[PDB]
Amino acid sequence: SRAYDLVVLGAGSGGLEAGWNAAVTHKKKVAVVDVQATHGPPLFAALGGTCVNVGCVPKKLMVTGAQYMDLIRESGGFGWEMDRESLCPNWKTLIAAKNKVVNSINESYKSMFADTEGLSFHMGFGALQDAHTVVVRKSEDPHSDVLETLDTEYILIATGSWPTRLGVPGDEFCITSNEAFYLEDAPKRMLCVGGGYIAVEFAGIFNGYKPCGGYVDLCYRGDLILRGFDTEVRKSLTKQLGANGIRVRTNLNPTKITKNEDGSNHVHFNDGTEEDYDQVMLAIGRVPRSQALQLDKAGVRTGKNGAVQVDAYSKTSVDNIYAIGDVTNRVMLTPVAINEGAAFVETVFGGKPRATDHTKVACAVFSIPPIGTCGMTEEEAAKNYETVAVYASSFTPLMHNISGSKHKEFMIRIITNESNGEVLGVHMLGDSAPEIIQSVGICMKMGAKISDFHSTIGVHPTSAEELCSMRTPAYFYESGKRVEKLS
Amino acid sequence: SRAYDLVVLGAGSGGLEAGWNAAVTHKKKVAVVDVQATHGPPLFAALGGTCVNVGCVPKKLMVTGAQYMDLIRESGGFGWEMDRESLCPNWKTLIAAKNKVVNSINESYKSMFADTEGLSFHMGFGALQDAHTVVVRKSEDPHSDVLETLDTEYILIATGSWPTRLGVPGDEFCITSNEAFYLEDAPKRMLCVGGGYIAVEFAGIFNGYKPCGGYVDLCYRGDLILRGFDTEVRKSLTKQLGANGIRVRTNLNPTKITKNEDGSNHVHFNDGTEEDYDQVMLAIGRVPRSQALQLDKAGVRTGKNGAVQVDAYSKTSVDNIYAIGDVTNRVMLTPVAINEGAAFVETVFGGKPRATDHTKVACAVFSIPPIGTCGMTEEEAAKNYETVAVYASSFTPLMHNISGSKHKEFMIRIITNESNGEVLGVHMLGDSAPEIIQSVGICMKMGAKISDFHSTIGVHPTSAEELCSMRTPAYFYESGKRVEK
Ligand SMILES: Cc1cc2nc3c(=O)[nH]c(=O)nc-3n(C[C@H](O)[C@H](O)[C@H](O)COP(=O)(O)OP(=O)(O)OC[C@H]3O[C@@H](n4cnc5c(N)ncnc54)[C@H](O)[C@@H]3O)c2cc1C
Ligand SMILES: Cc1cc2nc3c(=O)[nH]c(=O)nc-3n(C[C@H](O)[C@H](O)[C@H](O)COP(=O)(O)OP(=O)(O)OC[C@H]3O[C@@H](n4cnc5c(N)ncnc54)[C@H](O)[C@@H]3O)c2cc1C
Ligand SMILES: NC(=O)C1=CN([C@@H]2O[C@H](COP(=O)(O)OP(=O)(O)OC[C@H]3O[C@@H](n4cnc5c(N)ncnc54)[C@H](OP(=O)(O)O)[C@@H]3O)[C@@H](O)[C@H]2O)C=CC1
Ligand SMILES: NC(=O)C1=CN([C@@H]2O[C@H](COP(=O)(O)OP(=O)(O)OC[C@H]3O[C@@H](n4cnc5c(N)ncnc54)[C@H](OP(=O)(O)O)[C@@H]3O)[C@@H](O)[C@H]2O)C=CC1
Ligand SMILES: [Ag+]
Ligand SMILES: [Ag+]
Ligand SMILES: [Ag+]
Ligand SMILES: [Ag+]
Numbered sequence: 014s015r016a017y018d019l020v021v022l023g024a025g026s027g028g029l030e031a032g033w034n035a036a037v038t039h040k041k042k043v044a045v046v047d048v049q050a051t052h053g054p055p056l057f058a059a060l061g062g063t064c065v066n067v068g069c070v071p072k073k074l075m076v077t078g079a080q081y082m083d084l085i086r087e088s089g090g091f092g093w094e095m096d097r098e099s100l101c102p103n104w105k106t107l108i109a110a111k112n113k114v115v116n117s118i119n120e121s122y123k124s125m126f127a128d129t130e131g132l133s134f135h136m137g138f139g140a141l142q143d144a145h146t147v148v149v150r151k152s153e154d155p156h157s158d159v160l161e162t163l164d165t166e167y168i169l170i171a172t173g174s175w176p177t178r179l180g181v182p183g184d185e186f187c188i189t190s191n192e193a194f195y196l197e198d199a200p201k202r203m204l205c206v207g208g209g210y211i212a213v214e215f216a217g218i219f220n221g222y223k224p225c226g227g228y229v230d231l232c233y234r235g236d237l238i239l240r241g242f243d244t245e246v247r248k249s250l251t252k253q254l255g256a257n258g259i260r261v262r263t264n265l266n267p268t269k270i271t272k273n274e275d276g277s278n279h280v281h282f283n284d285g286t287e288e289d290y291d292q293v294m295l296a297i298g299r300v301p302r303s304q305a306l307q308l309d310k311a312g313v314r315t316g317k318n319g320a321v322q323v324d325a326y327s328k329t330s331v332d333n334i335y336a337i338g339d340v341t342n343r344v345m346l347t348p349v350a351i352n353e354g355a356a357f358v359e360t361v362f363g364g365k366p367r368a369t370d371h372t373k374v375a376c377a378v379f380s381i382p383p384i385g386t387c388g389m390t391e392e393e394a395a396k397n398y399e400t401v402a403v404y405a406s407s408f409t410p411l412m413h414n415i416s417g418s419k420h421k422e423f424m425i426r427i428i429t430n431e432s433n434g435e436v437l438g439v440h441m442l443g444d445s446a447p448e449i450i451q452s453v454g455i456c457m458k459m460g461a462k463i464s465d466f467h468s469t470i471g472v473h474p475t476s477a478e479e480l481c482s483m484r485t486p487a488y489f490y491e492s493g494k495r496v497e498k499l500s
Numbered sequence: 501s502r503a504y505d506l507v508v509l510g511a512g513s514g515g516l517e518a519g520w521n522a523a524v525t526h527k528k529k530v531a532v533v534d535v536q537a538t539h540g541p542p543l544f545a546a547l548g549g550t551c552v553n554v555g556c557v558p559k560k561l562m563v564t565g566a567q568y569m570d571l572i573r574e575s576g577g578f579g580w581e582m583d584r585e586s587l588c589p590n591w592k593t594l595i596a597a598k599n600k601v602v603n604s605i606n607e608s609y610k611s612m613f614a615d616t617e618g619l620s621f622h623m624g625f626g627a628l629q630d631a632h633t634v635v636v637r638k639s640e641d642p643h644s645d646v647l648e649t650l651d652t653e654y655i656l657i658a659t660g661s662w663p664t665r666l667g668v669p670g671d672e673f674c675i676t677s678n679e680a681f682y683l684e685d686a687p688k689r690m691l692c693v694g695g696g697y698i699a700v701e702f703a704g705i706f707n708g709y710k711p712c713g714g715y716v717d718l719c720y721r722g723d724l725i726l727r728g729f730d731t732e733v734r735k736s737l738t739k740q741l742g743a744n745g746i747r748v749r750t751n752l753n754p755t756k757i758t759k760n761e762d763g764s765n766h767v768h769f770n771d772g773t774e775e776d777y778d779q780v781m782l783a784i785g786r787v788p789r790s791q792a793l794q795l796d797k798a799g800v801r802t803g804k805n806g807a808v809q810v811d812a813y814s815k816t817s818v819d820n821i822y823a824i825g826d827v828t829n830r831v832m833l834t835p836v837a838i839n840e841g842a843a844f845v846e847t848v849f850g851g852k853p854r855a856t857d858h859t860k861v862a863c864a865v866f867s868i869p870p871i872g873t874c875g876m877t878e879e880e881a882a883k884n885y886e887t888v889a890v891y892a893s894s895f896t897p898l899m900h901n902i903s904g905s906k907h908k909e910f911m912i913r914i915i916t917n918e919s920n921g922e923v924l925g926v927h928m929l930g931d932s933a934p935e936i937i938q939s940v941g942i943c944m945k946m947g948a949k950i951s952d953f954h955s956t957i958g959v960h961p962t963s964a965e966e967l968c969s970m971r972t973p974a975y976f977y978e979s980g981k982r983v984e985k
Contacts (some may be wrong), residue, residue, distance in 0.1 A: 064960070070898065073961040077899045078578035084571050085580065091565035092590030092599055092709075093572065095582050103579030110577055110902040115935040117901070222579075347960040374957050385959075412558060412564045414604075415597040448932040451964035452939035455956045461946060469942045470861045471835040472550070472872075477938035478835065 016043045016164040018362070020147045021171055022139040022306065025062025027338035027350030028171030029122075034358040036131035041362060043132050044163050046139035051119040052112070057191040060134065063173050064347045065340075066115060074111050076214065076379045077103070079221020083257070083381070087416035096223040104199035104222050106405055111194070135161055141168070141311040144331050153305040167333050167361060170313075170321060171350070172306065174299035174339035179206075179276045183270025186278050187293045190215065200292035201227040204280060206267060208233030208240065212296035213254070219383035220258045229288070232262040232282070239378070243440035245389050245405070249424055252444055253382045267293075301340045307438055317342060325368040327357050335361070344371050375454030377447035382421060385450030387457055388438030391428055392440050397492035400431035400499070402486040404463065406479055410443075423476050427463060427483055431499070434462040439480075449477045504652040505849070507531045507627040507634040509793065512549025514608070514825040514837030515658030521845040523618035528849055530619050531650050533626035533636055538606040538748075539599070541808040544678040547609045547621065550660050550826075551834045553602060554681050559701060561598050563866045565589070566708020570744070574903035579614025591686035591709050598681075622648055628655070631818050640792045647800065654820050654848060657800075657808055658841070659793065661786035661826035666693075670757025673765055674780045677702065687779035688714040693754060694783035695720030695727070698864055700741070702781060704868040707745045717750040717777070719769075726865070730877050730913055730927035732892070737929060742868045743907040785860050788827045804829065812855040822848075831858050844901070864934035869908060872937030874944055875925035876915060882977040887918035889973035891950065893966055897931075910963050914950060914970060921949040926967075936964045 019035050021028045024047035036043040044473045049059045052066040056182070059066045082102070089097065126134040137149040137160045147168060149161035176189035188196075190211050199222040205212050212231060220229040231254070237262065251261050269281035270293065278292050303319045309322070314322035314330040320342035327335045335357055338350035353369045360366040375387035394401045404427040411419050423443030430438050440451050463483070471478030489499045505804070506522050508515045511534035523530040536546045539553040547565045568591070613621040624636040624647045633962065634655060663671035675683070677698050692699050696978045699718060707716040718725070720740070725748065726734050738748050760917035764778050778803035788807045795802050799808040801817045807829035814822045821846055825837035836856070843854040862874035881888045891914040900908050910930035916923050926940045943952070950970075958965030978981045 029861045054530060062841070070521070074899060074902060078580075078902075081571070081575040081578060081580050084568070085575060088568040088572060091568055092593040093565075093568050094590060095572075095587065100582065102582060106579040114898060116903050135526070167715075205902075245783055288979075348958040348965065352957050375959050377959050379961065397809075407570045411601065414601050415561060415565075440530070445932055445935040447959055447962050448935050448964045449939060450942065451956075451959045451962055452936060452967065454959070455948070455952060455968070456939065456942055456946065458956045459946065459948065459952055461942070466942060469938075469945050470833075470839050471856070472862050472864050472934055472938045472941070473834040474556045474866065475934050475938055477863070480939065 014471075015145065017044045017168050018165065019167045019169060020046065020139070020165040022046050022147065023062065023171035023173060023338070023340075024122075024134070025058075025171050025338055025350065026064040026347045027354040028062060028169070030351045030354035031127070031169055031337065031358050031486055033131060034355060034404075035362050036129055037364045039358070041131055044165065045132065045133055046052075046135045046137065046147065046163075048136070048138065050123060050134075050136065052115045053193040054192070057194075057279055058173070060119055062171075065118050066473070069184075070118065071111050071194055072214065073379060074114060075107065075218045075222075079218045080108050080381065082221045083418065087418055090415040090417050099225055100425075101224055102222050104196070107197070107222065126145045127400070135163070137138045138305065139162065139303065140307045141313065142307075143311055144168075144333060155307065155357055166220045167335065169357065170303070170306065170329075170334070170340055171337035171338045172302045172340050172356070174342075174345060175302040176295070177298035177300050178295055179267075179297055181268055181270065183278070186270050186272055187295050189295055193294055196292070199224060200290070201225075202277070202289060202291045203227070203229040204288075204290040204293045205229065205231045205296060206294065207296035208238030209298070213250070213378060213380045215237060215296070216254065216259050217257075220381070228258045228260060229258065231260055232265040232267070234266045236263045237393050238263070239384075241390075242378075242384065242386060244248045244392070245426060246384060246386075246424060246440050246442045249407075250382060250384065251424065252421075254380070257381055269354055271419040288419060299339065300344060301342050303340055326360050326366060327353055327369075331336065332488050344374060345452060346374070346376055349374065370458075372487050373454065373457045375450045375457075377450060379447065382443055383446045385446030385453075386439070386440040387450055387454045388426060388436070390438060390440070391490065394428050394430075394437045395495075398430055400439070400493065401490040402429045402431045402463075403488050403490065404429065405487040406483055408479065410476060423479070425479055425483070427466070427480070429463045431489065434464055436461050436463055436466070443476060445476050449480075452482075493496055502632070502651045502653060503891065504529045504531045504650055506656060507533065507626070507650045507652040508656045508658055509533050510549065510658035510660060510825070510827075511547045511609070511621070512825055512837065513658050513834045514659045514841035515549065515656070517838045517841035518656055518658070518824065518844050519558065519619060520616070521842060522849050523616055524773055524793050526845070526849040528618055531622055531652065532613075532646055533624065533650075534624045535625060535708070536623060537610055537621070539602045539798065540778065541679075541682045545660070547606055547939065549658075550737050552605055553677050555668070556834055557605065558598050558602055558681055560866065561601060562594065563701060563706045565594050566705050567868065568709045570905065574905055577889035577902040577904050578901075586712060588711050589709050591683075595682070598608040610880065618768070622650070624648065628800070631655075631820055642792070642794065645943060648934045654822065655792070655798075656821040656844065657793065657816075657821070657827050658825045658837070659789045659827050661832060662789045663827075664785040664787050665782055666784055668755055668757065670765075673757050673759055674782050676782055680781055683779070683782050686711060686714075687777070688712075689764070689776060689778045690716040691777040691780040692718045692783060693781065694785075695725030696783050696785065699783035700726065700737070700865060700867045702783065703741065703746050704744075709866075710931070716746050716785050717749060717775075718746055719752045719754070719768070721751070721753045723750045725750070728877070729865075729871065729873060730925075732913060733873075733911060733929045734803045736909065736911055737867060737869060737871065740909070741867070741936070742909055744868050786826065790827055813847050813853060813858075814840060814861060825830065831861060833861070833863055834941065836861065857945070860941070860944045862937045862944070864937060866934065870931065870933045872928040872935075872940070874937055874941045875923070877925060877927070878915060878977070881915050881924050882980055885917055885924070885977075886979065888924070889916045889918045890952070891916065891970040892974040893970055895966060897963060910966070912966055912970070914953070914967075916950045916973075918976065921951050923948050923953070925949055930963060932963055936967070940967075
């Protein structure tokens with residue numbers, strides 16, 4: 014009937030998941046469209062999506078590298094002795110090693126397309142022509158040469174999101190998360206704008222890889238970084254980023270940026286101050302990447318900042334056109350898009366339909382002291398629950414009395430419904446938190462109670478065993494108000 | 501009525517749990533008996549039990565120290581340059597800092613007793629006289645001076661366990677886990693006898709803290725270390741301990757040990773070979789410490805290796821006498837004894853009786869690549885289950901392509917009942933495994949199914965998220981047989 018069963022615009026986390034699934038476990042003719050084959054600074058994303066090329070994968074590698082600064086310093090207390098006087102890392106050999114790993118994943122995706130029959134990779138910029146036609150061009154410009162014209166039954170949009178910039182003079186002098194991955198040298202005088210995921214995470218990277226006398230300044234528009242997270246975790250993280258070197262700067266926002274006679278950028282703030290930074294990164298946000306896809310031509314509903322209007326099954330305004338991942342602007346994570354993609358395949362090609370559960374999704378923040386959250390905060394649970402108990406526990410891991418890093422305090426805060434005992438949210442700060450929160454997310458998806466926690470015999474010399482030691486709540490929330498006692 | 505409500509013999513993990521609980525949350529007159537107040541060689545354990553003084557606490561500190569050997573080496577690939585040749589750690593400043601931490605906990609317990617009313621610490625060797633009288637002597641000898649005579653309603657035994665040696669000539673030339681904590685110098689030529697918990701853990705410590713050209717030989721009586729653990733996890737550890745430096749030797753056992761004219765020990769093996777070790781540690785096992793408690797005088801039953809025979813509520817032969825922890829020889833762990841102790845309090849002084857759940861208890865092995873297990877192995881689940889599915893997954897963390905340690909392979913193995921899909925066992929090998937297994941243990945006590953795992957949306961750049969990626973089983977066991985499908 015048609016040339017392909019599916020054309021996937023975007024070979025991302027979600028995109029490739031659906032592509033492979035339709036082609037292998039259903040034997041369908043699948044075409045996957047993407048910008049380029051291997052990662053690279055002209056057009057950053059590639060085969061594997063942001064996640065693989067300019068996202069989670071390289072980020073984690075760099076965060077792991079920066080984490081050594083602490084560990085090399087901490088080793089002293091345990092009897093490990095070396096030349097610690099102004100010891101600095103090699104940024105060039107990090108990026109070198111990072112690229113070799115990213116490209117290796119790029120390369121194994123190439124041979125995947127050469128070895129899987131039904132799957133075909135189509136390089137270029139995809140755009141919609143009608144309900145059944147996707148046109149591949151060599152540019153985002155609608156007037157540039159047409160490389161391919163794909164005729165398909167279904168169309169899936171998985172083009173993800175794209176960095177947001179702030180509309181100020183000197184905006185193009187700044188870098189984003191994209192450019193950060195390919196910097197020639199590690200900046201000495203660094204400014205991270207914003208208080209989001211990337212802002213906090215990258216602040217840690219640069220602070221680990223700063224040269225001599227270098228400093229990283231994080232500035233945030235509001236008065237507490239990481240809005241939406243547990244207020245007590247946020248405050249404790251702010252304190253710990255400081256103790257680690259990163260100078261946090263609340264209620265501050267840049268307005269003017271100009272370049273100097275040495276390359277460095279001159280930044281003008283809100284309070285009127287002027288400081289000189291070698292690099293300035295903007296972690297403002299990520300808007301869904303759909304501006305060039307010509308959704309109007311096919312009649313696909315575009316809403317909140319270019320987000321693609323979808324229902325619970327990812328179906329758009331047109332019955333055969335679907336969208337998954339960051340482009341839908343639901344929950345912008347890698348494992349979410351993968352689930353949304355697998356659920357899409359099961360729905361249309363599998364027969365048995367299934368919707369993606371967006372609630373109670375465990376995620377992490379790979380800041381130097383990492384965060385692990387799943388579920389509701391105090392503010393949210395007290396907002397729409399009758400009565401809620403709040404459990405709290407802060408402890409310094411015993412090893413840190415030797416290592417010297419006494420600021421490193423592990424924190425667990427469980428938020429439960431008082432009526433039932435149901436765990437509505439668990440919030441963690443400290444090493445191993447992203448690992449621990451994963452299996453917590455399993456429990457919350459099972460709908461677990463606080464009684465299920467402190468009844469499990471612990472595993473002693475661990476941080477996670479502290480989940481099972483919280484019996485008495487710190488305080489309560491009664492019909493909205495913060496109360497220290499409950500009659 | 502009489503002097504004390506409770507006399508606890510042993511200020512251990514469980515002993516101190518039962519003491520504090522009865523005294524604070526029930527306002528009972530509680531006496532706690534122990535050998536000494538601060539850690540120290542002559543009699544190793546102190547206030548806090550084995551676990552605090554010569555157990556989990558110091559062990560973990562030393563395992564964390566050793567892990568820096570890998571971490572310093574691994575940093576190179578990420579751009580961290582320094583002097584790496586001949587770089588060996590300072591053992592003396594490790595023990596120094598270890599002692600400082602252990603002593604502060606000792607001190608913390610000392611001020612606890614002085615501030616908690618009802619609780620009183622009584623230094624000396626406790627021994628039974630009758631169903632209500634506990635005698636405190638200055639020595640383990642039953643004829644040394646009597647320091648105190650405590651008269652109590654209830655008696656709780658929490659004296660824990662003690663290292664086992666092997667009956668061979670040269671047995672007293674060896675060290676145990678106890679002496680290992682207070683070695684004056686890090687051994688160059690090390691031998692670890694046995695293939696149990698302590699063996700694998702300490703092998704990693706000494707291998708981390710070995711001087712120049714040093715080596716650690718681990719010898720085990722059988723042909724695969726750590727019996728009772730997942731056979732595939734065991735084999736993968738054996739390779740990784742090897743790759744990390746430790747030379748594993750199976751089907752081998754020492755028989756004769758003699759000292760030389762420089763201090764070093766000469767060891768005669770099972771195959772007939774002889775080799776020289778600066779130090780030789782015996783991780784043979786731990787027998788319940790009840791040899792000098794005179795349970796006969798009070799009429800308390802001692803069965804297999806002197807273990808105090810108890811029911812599900814810790815009650816012994818006599819209705820007032822109880823026992824918890826390693827001395828019962830049920831499950832020799834710190835959090836087990838704490839639970840046994842807390843349940844003991846609830847049983848008698850709390851009103852509401854409660855028994856300790858010994859099945860499906862998550863534990864860990866702090867090897868250089870750590871282990872995290874909970875529930876049944878393949879062998880055990882195939883013995884007493886109709887049909888069982890075996891899920892397996894091995895993967896190299898992405899960072900290890902840069903760090904150079906490509907041998908460090910993370911492994912997860914889930915063992916489920918094929919009938920309903922119930923998770924009967926989870927076995928892990930790699931970093932964070934002891935952290936991950938804890939919340940796995942929450943699920944298994946919760947009675948979780950494999951469908952609960954792979955239906956949870958993961959947390960991408962983690963090792964624990966792979967737990968939710970196992971959908972199709974590697975193979976099956978059908979009525980006992982290893983079945984392809
Ligand atoms: C720096 C950074 C770090 C992150 N770290 C994490 C993390 O640690 N954990 C986590 O869960 N999430 C993380 N995220 C988010 C995660 O990377 C995304 O949510 C994920 O990539 C979404 O998958 P997707 O398939 O929807 O989009 P993507 O994976 O980004 O796929 C989009 C692909 O579509 C292609 N494309 C774009 N336009 C077109 C077009 N015109 N025609 C054809 N193809 C096109 C692009 O080239 C791109 O390859 C991070 C994000 C960033 C930016
Ligand atoms: C090296 C090592 C590492 C370990 N690591 C871990 C681990 O990481 N995780 C884990 O879960 N378990 C671990 N264990 C096991 C754990 O330490 C014990 O199971 C736990 O301490 C048991 O608690 P208990 O109260 O029954 O005995 P203990 O905590 O050992 O208490 C016994 C106390 O009784 C005292 N005592 C002895 N005889 C008398 C007497 N005659 N009169 C009065 N008092 C007496 C002793 O001085 C001692 O202080 C480890 C054990 C060892 C040896
Ligand atoms: N799971 C993980 O480990 C990671 C996930 N991600 C995903 O990718 C996305 C990356 O977006 P990111 O921007 O880094 O994080 P966010 O979009 O969550 O947060 C952006 C921050 O920038 C601030 N901000 C927004 N607009 C402005 C402005 N105009 N001027 C100054 N400050 C502003 C916001 O302030 P305010 O709070 O006041 O609105 C907020 O603190 C995340 O949303 C997340 O979904 C990214 C990295 C890691
Ligand atoms: N949870 C944790 O992290 C830790 C817990 N522990 C606790 O300490 C307890 C005791 O540890 P451990 O001392 O290592 O005892 P184990 O029972 O754990 O292991 C003893 C090892 O020595 C071997 N062995 C036994 N008898 C002899 C013998 N006569 N000659 C030669 N080899 C022999 C055994 O092999 P085989 O019997 O298979 O032939 C076994 O491999 C453990 O049960 C555990 O509860 C200790 C350290 C860490
Ligand atoms: Ag990713
Ligand atoms: Ag559960
Ligand atoms: Ag302990
Ligand atoms: Ag669970």
